């Protein structure tokens, strides 16, 4: 869910925690099973 382009000043969403180590892995697995059905992204998508 991370596009190859990234805004500089970053945010704080738990979305930025998925599929990363160092956390209570339970939590990342929970977020992952909760997001797959949705449509989520991050960073630039289109430039009109």
């Amino acid at each position: 869910a991370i596009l190859p382009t990234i805004p500089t000043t970053t945010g704080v969403s738990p979305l930025l925690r998925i599929d990363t180590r160092t956390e209570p892995i339970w939590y990342n697995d929970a977020i992952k099973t909760l997001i797959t059905n949705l449509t989520i992204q991050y960073g630039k998508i289109k430039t009109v």
Partner: protein
């Protein structure tokens, strides 16, 4: 107590921290083990 196993690891990037220490101890402190990884890129420098 690992006797004869060959661990195929692929992504080499996401393994939280435990299995790192476990894999290392079992390559040590083990009888006949093998940890292959057929996706690591390395520049070889061969000399005698």
């Amino acid at each position: 107590d690992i006797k004869n196993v060959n661990f195929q690891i692929d992504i080499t990037g996401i393994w939280p921290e435990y299995v790192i220490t476990l894999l290392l101890r079992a390559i040590n402190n083990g009888f006949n083990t093998y940890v292959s990884m057929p996706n690591i890129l390395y520049k070889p420098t061969i000399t005698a």
